[PDB]
Amino acid sequence: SIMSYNGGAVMAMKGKNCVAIAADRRFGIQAQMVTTDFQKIFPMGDRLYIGLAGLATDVQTVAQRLKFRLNLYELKEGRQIKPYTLMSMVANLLYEKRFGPYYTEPVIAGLDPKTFKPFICSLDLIGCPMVTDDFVVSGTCAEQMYGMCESLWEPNMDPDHLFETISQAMLNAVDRDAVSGMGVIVHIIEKDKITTRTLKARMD
């Protein structure tokens, strides 16, 4: 499978007035770990991040080309992009390649730049958007992630509880997946700050 060549996992999760996004840190090629600090989550705004799992080369290309579009959008418009509008921008970018797609399935997490309402979504590799009110997951251990998220997530969690839940969902999910892990990074997004943590994690 093309999507398991590099392995990898991302997830996002919604709390009261806050969102969280997390990713493993492995860059590998089939069985071989090549590096353990590979970036998969990218800032698209002060309170808006995109996480990409899939083929590492397309993770990078889609992040970059998205950034190109977004920068042009922001310069032209008065303003910071809305979360929902970023989703659409990304949907359009992916579907342009409907017949030879990028092999990446992004998640977006953010707060509205004016209202600060929480937003999360994911898209498939051809740009079908899915907005949810709880969590989204993408990568080679999607099933593991679904199991953790379905069991742990609760409505209206504060930043501290959201952090614990996303962390435990990620760590335990990736620990059942041979080609994800080597570290987990987590960003909590609040009105007034971003908190970025790497977790203590298995390195096998």
Binding site: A31, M33, D177, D204
Partner: protein
Amino acid sequence: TTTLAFKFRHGVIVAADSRATAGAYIASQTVKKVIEINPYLLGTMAGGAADCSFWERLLARQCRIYELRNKERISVAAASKLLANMVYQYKGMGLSMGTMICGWDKRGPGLYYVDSEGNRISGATFSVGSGSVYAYGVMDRGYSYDLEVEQAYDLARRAIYQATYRDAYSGGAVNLYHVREDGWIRVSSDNVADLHEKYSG
């Protein structure tokens, strides 16, 4: 999987990881990949889990029958050859097994690599499994026939550990054994997460 074994002045060190996988799904972190054939003989497992466990258990049965019939411990050579001859018949049928047979007999410390392709070879050191290439690098840079016992334990432990780090299909714990003239002993079982804390560039 990563397994290794080496002969040295004080016997044979045998070490393995403990991960099993079904595709990229981790099915277990607690597999015992060192089989106790008798108190003087160990076998290691890499490849197909069912194939290794079945055929090494069958080797154990046969070594025991041998001992009852002949009134003496089977040699390392003979045990390895019994396994080789059993699997030879199945070549081409998709058995997947790479084993080290490790003991101490009247020729002293003994070590043979045996696999489902039909190889059977004696040697000083071997590593087998998807992580073997990583283990070979560390093992080879540290190996000597005149290693002290504790230096030898350190080498085996570290080599497997490094393999777990690079190889997606190796992990869990390092299980280490020492074949001495009066029998093998189980030396240690160390979780790779605890070894990471400790090590060591």
